[PDB]
């Protein structure tokens, strides 16, 4: 019966992942900037890469005993990340820079998670969970480099 | 300004495609049948293939002048295809066989569409739209062969 | 029940395809000419290519509802193309040049077909049927170039 | 002039091979079973493999001095293997199991042959003839394992 | 004798294709912009792709009976597309944007063509002709996205 | 001299791994079920994968200072996993399902181990040891999905 | 019922093969010599190659009717080849040179076998059995070349 | 400012290269000979190879400071090689054998050039210029071997 | 502002890595031993592999907020590893065996590091830092096997 | 001491192989015919293939105990095949057709050999020796097909 | 003893190459510009390419008799190229543009060298030395195209 | 008629190349040393590489007008390199070290040649001739490194 702990949280990320997913395929479909060509391949290269993180993240669930979800009602509700309007351009000089301010929070979520995994004795979970932070961490670095350092 | 005709309908399929998408990633994540191993690879092989149909279908929009959508509110509303509960098993002997009764309707939708394209003079649209029916038609055949012929 | 129209005709080509098939593997096995080496690779490159056209052509049947045939009695009877004797050489200066005068007629058959498809509303059929004429058309051109233009 | 011995027998197998060939492309086109997906790939994987055995077997002829055949009249007559009706299903619990009871006899034919080759001093023939028994022997094993051992 | 119709027009596109060809290898050789590196690979990726469209377009001619041309006198005369001076930069804010305003017109030409093909009963011509519009249509979209939407 | 701790335990898994190894090559050689074809490839895909886990696990030993073993006397004695009789079939509805109830225990063993590694300060050991649990964990999930969830 | 002859002997080699197998993975794990790097890749290249000989050798059994074994009790008993202590070094100047004096005997065993196959009329067995002697013969040559010719 | 010397001559070859280019795609499109198949691939294999020589030759210009041309007016004027009529056949027994008598002269041009490079101290130019003579020299040899030696 | 802790230490390894780097390309360039050929490929295989460890290690810095260094003054000063003279031979029987006694210390450094990472809550750092110890640990093992075990 | 029998004969073929070798690289270097291009690739494809037959044939020697030769004095003396003058053309209508009348005799030599192997109990020798006749037999067939059947 | 001439100068370039090397891995690690993504791949694509130039350049030394260096003291002293501060941005509008003004001088150095090689009779040295100027020359062109032509 | 100069000398190297060729396949077949495995691959890697040098060197002849030779009488006579006895071992501490003292002289021959090419105005010859010295020069360096530096 045990192991609901960090499990119910997988749905937390599992949910916010498919939201960053279609926003990505949104950055990717409407984009209209000078860099274009690239910012068209690299966005694809992201949602394509968090595409693989979404399936496995889902399979961690099944690993234990849980039965993953795929419903949408439970995405546009569970996620700690919201949709992007139909924008204005590719980049965004102000605070929220989606392309930049999106991976930033999930790193916190999982950051949060890992500890509980760093407790409940689920080295298997953290092995891949914390495998993703490395994953997502570079995609953070790379982006805030399209603008400017800081943090 | 022209060309809203078959364009507004792309969103019709564009919408029902991402619904069959995550249902597929649902068949794919919970599945628990004897065939398993295979039906675990082939479902992936489907949503992976209608994944590519979803992006291009979206790019047909941008081809003309339209600006594609990626919002979810406009998927679980626009689509002529609904979500799957958390099922009961892989197959389903009764009428609706999702894995089978899903591709079946979009073929109609597009069937419908094509004519309007088969009129408005958008050979470019139909060249790929009707490129998909061939696409999806085999995936229909293949499935209703897991059960039985008919139609 | 519908769709027997262009379906019963698939068997028409489906039949004449397996006849051009083994004639090809006949040109390919006995050939004894100067070009040889090549006319030995290219014949193979043909029957290997109409090999793939034969399977799919057969799968169009199953697409709809029909159940394809594979019997021989129904090939050496249905086909609008006949066998080659044990020849005399590779080329043939007179009218019928098999290697040349074979693809020529099926283009007519299908030519004929397409219209009925270009009517019954089977864009899926024509999409691949007329996909083959392009296919077979170059293999016509290429050959009548081993001899001389005309038509 | 010599070497008609085992040569006239090549036509014996050469004939029964193209019969098992299209029956295979028959198992492959109509099949409608649960295993499906797999048994749809593996049947293809058979007739694709006895496809290569058919050409070379034909080229052994030309090796010596003989001129191979490709006519059909001489297949549905020479062969020691007959066509399959339009079946009833994929498997078959009774004696003749085509998918199983087909390779079984050619192994005898060739078995028979080899000796004559194992006499006339045609190590080149047997090197590949008996190369095929190994070939076909596993495809026998594999199949009667889909049902049950015995023999 | 027939089929001069859409044939004489192939030379129309066949001509304007080799003009967009070397202009491309012109955009590609002198370019001096910030994007550079990318716009140096993507221009190459264009003329490399319309390179393949030029040969086949030429082979459609030979398909029928016509004998393609390769002379230059008949390019800088037949084409409905003109050469680029030695420019001023990569992009161009005003109306004509070559890199953008070039594919735009051939789409019309062929658009025009197709109908006549969409009449004379040359499904083989249209199958590839209209195969190119899809081709070239995306390269239009992609470009006018380096600047701004509209149309 | 230090580091005998988790080292002597490597032999514990190192031993039970080569036992699951040949049992796998046992499931793989005698198997006779309906799924067959697949379950004949996937079993191979297992023992092939725990084949690589066996060598490296052995090389962790040499990493430190230890000299790995390869003797059999020390496998059919050290292992916490026993051999399979010559079975009865592929699957097994009762408790012990080898194909299923085998990976299950080593996960415990190592589970146990990791802690001691999660203490002695051998992050290098755990990095790969716990790299295997992820490894083996999916192969558990996958299997108990051929039957039914639970745990 | 027949064919126990050379069959019961397959187990003879089948047994001694898995013994040379783990000794190899023993030479491969402890080795500590100057050549090292190589003598570390080539040993792997051996047991990796007799790994494939072990599976097929086992499948010859199933070819006929026999049901292969995988138990260890029946390896450290049936084999005509014994385990290696934990050695002293890589090479060995005296008579028994394992790395050298191991393949040497199985060549005899099989040598012996083949005749019985070279009698019972199992060309399929010998085709691969004697396929292995060529196999193993070079690995003999290669090794006794690391030391000195002779025989 | 310097380096106009051998630079203005690059345009000399750069010009005659695009002329041999489309003549090649002319030999390649109309050809109608016995060798055909081969001479249809090898001509392609030429213009495809002098295609790469044309771009780099153009990039040598940009290397220094020059800005390459792509205009046609400056090809059918600058070149020391003229167009081919719509021929009569593939080969040509008399003096000028295009397929043969074309590479022959550019070897002279460049021959000429190199010296000036073999003077002005542009080892970088000659390194690739004289890289091309080796290039084109074999294509000379190969061709005059389709006819007869001499020179 | 936080996270200077383990960050300032990355420069510690980042520094000693480029020192082992060119010493490697030193072992690699002067080497003159019997093993040669191998020890010429394997040394390359090392510095090529710690080449990738050097860039990422540098990118961990940028991950957080730090701006990596590349200056040399800060390598031949920061590093806890010194240069090799122009040696005497490939191997070295005494204590310091560079090729062996080099990876040995960085394992300590990082060993040291990890703890601080194993505290500050930088699972992302340790995930790759401790990913390297596994990395470098085998290269230690492998080497001290070219000589003798111990430790 | 035994096994000089068929061994001294390997040198017989080993010798005549390197003679057909450089004659091939002679056919290959001077050739001047119409087929050219092909007959320039296929000759290469021969001597490249009998190149591999020459090394292994040599390694059969070392297999046993013999020490292969590589001297030339012992080729232009031992061989039962002689050099080609500097010819007159590619083909040759009369009896000896080298390109054709060369493989023809070695097939006899080995034919002869095999028996002695087919006696002395060297299944390993014959397995590859008779592996070559199949090899060389097709290259015979192929050639006498460039001219005419017969034998 | 001879050949110190151009040899002592290899160290001149060999030295300045490893300086441009880590500056490159400096442009590559800190870069923060709009182009970013591209200029992050292309810089890597440079130092990766002058990485290969550095090793071979070093191996030219060993070619003759010299024993290459790898010490750093002898780089930050021998080189005619200096380190980059921790910059300000990616590009630089003023004179020295590193990314641009770096390859520029080594071309001179080597330019200088070649002559001495173009004298001492070391065609082997110049063959690769002047192989590099072509190398580096394009990387010059490409860069000064990111800004503006000139020279 | 001209160009006999450096041409007659190609035969000089062309001759000594096929002698180093079979000596290589002699070092390669009898070798019996400790390094073995490596020195068995690297020797092959030499004669395989001077194999390609032999064909092209021969094609330089045909480039001009000359008709290459392939006779042996003209190798064991023309060459400035002699055969190796059946040796004593792999290495050789005294002066002549074949494996080492063989490439050494051809470098002189060609050295000699180049000048005459460095005169007669055959930049095409020298481009590849001096392409080989770089080739062979490294194979010199590598070998005299298996022993000791010097020269
Ligand atoms: Fe895209
Ligand atoms: Fe998945
Ligand atoms: Fe999966
Ligand atoms: Fe896309
Ligand atoms: Fe063939
Ligand atoms: Fe199929
Ligand atoms: Fe299929
Ligand atoms: Fe064939
Ligand atoms: Fe370029
Ligand atoms: Fe073409
Ligand atoms: Fe298998
Ligand atoms: Fe290993
Ligand atoms: Fe290993
Ligand atoms: Fe197997
Ligand atoms: Fe073509
Ligand atoms: Fe280019
Ligand atoms: Fe190297
Ligand atoms: Fe990097
Ligand atoms: Fe060639
Ligand atoms: Fe060899
Ligand atoms: Fe990177
Ligand atoms: Fe190197
Ligand atoms: Fe070998
Ligand atoms: Fe060649």
Alpha-carbon distance of F58 to F74, in angstroms, equals 14
Supply the DSSP string of F47-71, one letter for each residue.
Answer: HTHHHHHHHHHHHHHHHHT------
- Cα torsion E30, E34, E35, E37 to 10°: value is 60
Q: Which two tokens stand for residue D7?
A: 């040569």
Alpha-carbon distance of G69 to G78, in angstroms, equals 11
Residue H119: phi and psi, rounded to 5, are: -145, -65
* Ligand 12 midpoint to CA F59 (Å): 7
Q: Residue B127: its chain E contacts at CB < 8 A?
A: 130-131, 133-134
Q: Residue H34: its chain C contacts at CB < 8 A?
A: 34-35, 146
* Ligand 22 midpoint to CA L150 (Å): 20
Alpha-carbon distance of A128 to A124, in angstroms, equals 7
G35–L31 CB contact, under 8 Å: no
Chain C interface mutation, best of B130, B132, B134, highest count of C Cβ atoms under 10 Å: B134
Whole-angstrom CA distances from I134 to F50, F127, L113 are 19, 7, 55
Alpha-helical runs (H) found in H5-150: 5-30, 37-41, 44-47, 49-64, 103-120, 123-143
Q: Are B19 and B82 in contact (CB under 8 A)?
A: yes
Q: What's chain C's length in residues?
A: 151
Alpha-carbon distance of E21 to J142, in angstroms, equals 44
Whole-angstrom CA distances from D88 to C62, D22, D92, F35 are 16, 17, 9, 20
Q: Are L143 and L99 in contact (CB under 8 A)?
A: yes
The enclosing H or E element of E62 equals: helix E49-64
D123–J137 CB contact, under 8 Å: no
| Among chain H residues, CA nearest to E69 | H26
Exposure letters F41-61 (e unless 16+ CB within 10 A, then b): ebbbebbeebbebbbebbbbb
| Among chain B residues, CA nearest to E151 | B65
Alpha-carbon distance of C14 to E72, in angstroms, equals 45
Q: For every residue of A78-111, which 3-state class applies, written as one string?
A: CCCCCCCCCCCCCCCCCCCCCCCCCHHHHHHHHH
- Which residues of K are annotated binding-site positions for Fe(3+)? 28, 40, 55, 59
How large is the angle between the packed helices J103-120 and J123-143, nearest 10 degrees? Answer: 160
Q: Residue E145: its chain B contacts at CB < 8 A?
A: 62
Q: Residue B37: its chain F contacts at CB < 8 A?
A: 35, 38-39, 42, 142, 146
Q: Which of B142, B6, B133 is nearest to B61 (CA)?
A: B6
Interface contacts (F, G; CB < 8 Å): 70
Alpha-carbon distance of K90 to G107, in angstroms, equals 68
C34–J145 CB contact, under 8 Å: no
Q: Which chains touch E (3 or more CB pairs under 8 A)?
A: A, B, C, H, K
Q: Are G75 and F79 in contact (CB under 8 A)?
A: no
Q: Which of L27, L17, L111, L108 is nearest to L59 (CA)?
A: L17
Judged on CB neighbours under 10 Å (0-12, 13-18, 19+), B86 is: exposed
Q: Which of F98, F25, F100, F42 is nearest to G70 (CA)?
A: F25
Alpha-helical runs (H) found in C1-151: 5-30, 37-41, 44-47, 49-64, 103-120, 123-143
Interface contacts (K, L; CB < 8 Å): 28
Q: Are B133 and C124 in contact (CB under 8 A)?
A: yes
Q: Which of B140, F137, K19 is nearest to C62 (CA)?
A: B140
* A119 contacts: CB under 8 Å, gap ≥ 6: none
Residue I74: phi and psi, rounded to 5, are: -90, 25
Judged on CB neighbours under 10 Å (0-12, 13-18, 19+), H96 is: exposed
Q: Residue H32: its chain C contacts at CB < 8 A?
A: 145, 148-149
* Ligand 12 midpoint to CA F54 (Å): 9
Q: What's chain H's length in residues?
A: 151
Give the resolution in Å: 2.6
F30–G58 CB contact, under 8 Å: no
Q: Which of J79, J86, J101, J87 is nearest to J146 (CA)?
A: J101
Alpha-helical runs (H) found in F31-122: 37-47, 49-64, 103-120
Q: What's chain F's length in residues?
A: 151
DSSP one-letter code for E99: T
Token pair 């200072």 is found at F65
What are the residues of chain I with a beta carbon less than 8 Å away from any beta carbon of chain K?
Answer: 18-19, 22-23, 25-26, 28-30, 55, 58-59, 61-62, 67-73, 75-76, 83-84, 86
Whole-angstrom CA distances from H6 to E26, F121, H17, H41, I30 are 21, 69, 16, 34, 42
CA B82 to the chain's CA centroid: 12
Exposure letters G43-73 (e unless 16+ CB within 10 A, then b): bbebbeebbebbbebbbbbbbbbbebbbbbe
F148–B32 CB contact, under 8 Å: yes
Q: For every residue of chain D, which 3-state class applies, written as one string?
A: CCCCHHHHHHHHHHHHHHHHHHHHHHHHHHCCCCCCHHHHHHHHHHHCHHHHHHHHHHHHHHHHCCCCCCCCCCCCCCCCCCCCCCCCCCCCCCCCCCCCCCHHHHHHHHHHHHHHHHHHCCHHHHHHHHHHHHHHHHHHHHHCCCCCCCC
Q: Which of L34, D111, K44, J26 is nearest to G39 (CA)?
A: L34
Alpha-carbon distance of I74 to F100, in angstroms, equals 56
Alpha-carbon distance of J38 to C34, in angstroms, equals 11
Q: Which of L127, E73, G49, D100 is nearest to H110 (CA)?
A: L127
K145–E38 CB contact, under 8 Å: no
Work out the minimum CA distance from H107 to partner chain K, whole angstroms.
21
Alpha-helical runs (H) found in K65-122: 103-120
Q: Are H31 and E70 in contact (CB under 8 A)?
A: no
Q: For chain I, how are helix, strand and coil distributed in percent, rounded to 5? A: 60, 0, 40
Write down all domains in chain E, each with its CATH number in brackets. 1-151 (1.20.1260.10)
Alpha-carbon distance of E90 to A36, in angstroms, equals 15
Q: Which two tokens stand for residue C60?
A: 């169009």
Alpha-carbon distance of H14 to G147, in angstroms, equals 62
Whole-angstrom CA distances from J68 to J11, J12, J60, K19 are 8, 12, 9, 53
Q: Are K59 and L141 in contact (CB under 8 A)?
A: yes
* Ligand 13 midpoint to CA I87 (Å): 29
Residue J65: phi and psi, rounded to 5, are: -165, -20
Q: Which two tokens stand for residue B86?
A: 């958390």
Rg of chain K in Å (alpha carbons): 16
**Nearest CB to L63: which of H118, H130, H137?**
H137
Q: Are I127 and A133 in contact (CB under 8 A)?
A: yes
Alpha-carbon distance of I74 to I14, in angstroms, equals 10
Q: Residue E137: its chain B contacts at CB < 8 A?
A: 63, 124
Q: Which chains touch I (3 or more CB pairs under 8 A)?
A: A, F, G, K, L
- Cα torsion J55, J57, J59, J60 to 10°: value is 170
Token pair 């299997």 is found at F143
Alpha-carbon distance of G151 to G97, in angstroms, equals 14
CA F97 to the chain's CA centroid: 15
**Nearest CB to K32: which of A34, A42, A145?**
A145
Q: Are J17 and J57 in contact (CB under 8 A)?
A: yes
Q: Are D22 and C75 in contact (CB under 8 A)?
A: no
Q: Are J29 and H139 in contact (CB under 8 A)?
A: no
- Which residues of H are annotated binding-site positions for Fe(3+)? 28, 40, 55, 59
J18–L22 CB contact, under 8 Å: yes
Alpha-carbon distance of F134 to K20, in angstroms, equals 43
J130–D127 CB contact, under 8 Å: yes
Determination technique for this PDB entry? Answer: X-ray
Q: Residue G69: its chain F contacts at CB < 8 A?
A: 26, 86
CA G116 to the chain's CA centroid: 19
Query: Hey, how many other C-beta atoms are within 10 angstroms of the C-beta on B26?
Result: 23
The enclosing H or E element of A50 equals: helix A49-64
Region of residue B94 (phi > 0: left; psi between -120 and 50: alpha; otherwise: beta)? beta
Exposure letters D70-96 (e unless 16+ CB within 10 A, then b): bbbeebbebbebebbeeeeebbeeeee
Alpha-carbon distance of G98 to C138, in angstroms, equals 63
Q: Are G33 and I145 in contact (CB under 8 A)?
A: no
Q: Residue J34: its chain H contacts at CB < 8 A?
A: 34-35, 146
L123–H131 CB contact, under 8 Å: no
Alpha-carbon distance of E147 to A34, in angstroms, equals 7
Query: Hey, how many other C-beta atoms are within 10 angstroms of the C-beta on B106?
Result: 24
A142–K37 CB contact, under 8 Å: yes
Nearest ligand to the CA atom of G55: 14
Token pair 């792509």 is found at H70
Q: Which of B82, B107, B75, B97 is nearest to B144 (CA)?
A: B97
Q: Which of G7, G32, G21 is nearest to G54 (CA)?
A: G21
Residue K18: phi and psi, rounded to 5, are: -75, -10
Report the SS3 class of residue A129: helix
Alpha-carbon distance of B16 to B57, in angstroms, equals 12
F72–G55 CB contact, under 8 Å: no
Q: Long-range contact list for G129-132, CB < 8 A, 24+ apart?
A: G129/G60, G130/J123, G130/J124, G130/J127, G131/J127, G132/G53, G132/G57
Nearest ligand to the CA atom of G25: 12
I38–G37 CB contact, under 8 Å: yes
DSSP one-letter code for G31: -
Work out the minimum CA distance from B56 to partner chain D, whole angstroms.
27
Q: Residue B30: its chain A contacts at CB < 8 A?
A: 62, 67-68
- Chains G and F touch, contact meaning at least 3 pairs of CB atoms under 8 angstroms apart: yes
D31–B145 CB contact, under 8 Å: yes
Judged on CB neighbours under 10 Å (0-12, 13-18, 19+), G138 is: middle
Judged on CB neighbours under 10 Å (0-12, 13-18, 19+), C105 is: middle
Alpha-carbon distance of G133 to G141, in angstroms, equals 12
Token pair 């070279």 is found at G118
Q: Are A27 and A99 in contact (CB under 8 A)?
A: yes
Supply the DSSP string of chain L, one letter for each residue.
Answer: ----HHHHHHHHHHHHHHHHHHHHHHHHHH---SSTHHHHHTTHHHHTHHHHHHHHHHHHHHHHT------STTTTTT-SS----S-SSS---SS--TTSTTHHHHHHHHHHHHHHHHHHT-HHHHHHHHHHHHHHHHHHHHHTTTS----
């Amino acid at each position: 019966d045990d192991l609901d702990a960090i499990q119910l949280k997988l749905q937390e990320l599992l949910a916010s992942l498919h939201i960053f997913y279609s926003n990505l395929r949104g950055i990717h479909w409407n984009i209209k900037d000078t860099n274009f060509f690239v910012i068209h391949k690299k966005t694809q290269k992201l949602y394509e890469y968090i595409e693989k993180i979404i399936d496995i993240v889902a399979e961690r669930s099944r690993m234990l005993g849980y039965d993953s979800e795929f419903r949408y009602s439970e995405f546009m509700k569970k996620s700690f990340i919201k949709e992007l309007d139909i924008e204005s351009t590719s980049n965004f000089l102000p605070s929220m820079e989606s392309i930049v301010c999106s991976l930033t929070e999930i790193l916190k979520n999982i950051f949060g998670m890992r500890k509980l995994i760093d407790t409940a004795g689920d080295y298997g979970t953290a092995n891949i969970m914390d495998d993703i932070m490395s994953d997502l961490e570079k995609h953070l670095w790379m982006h805030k480099a399209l603008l400017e350092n800081c943090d």
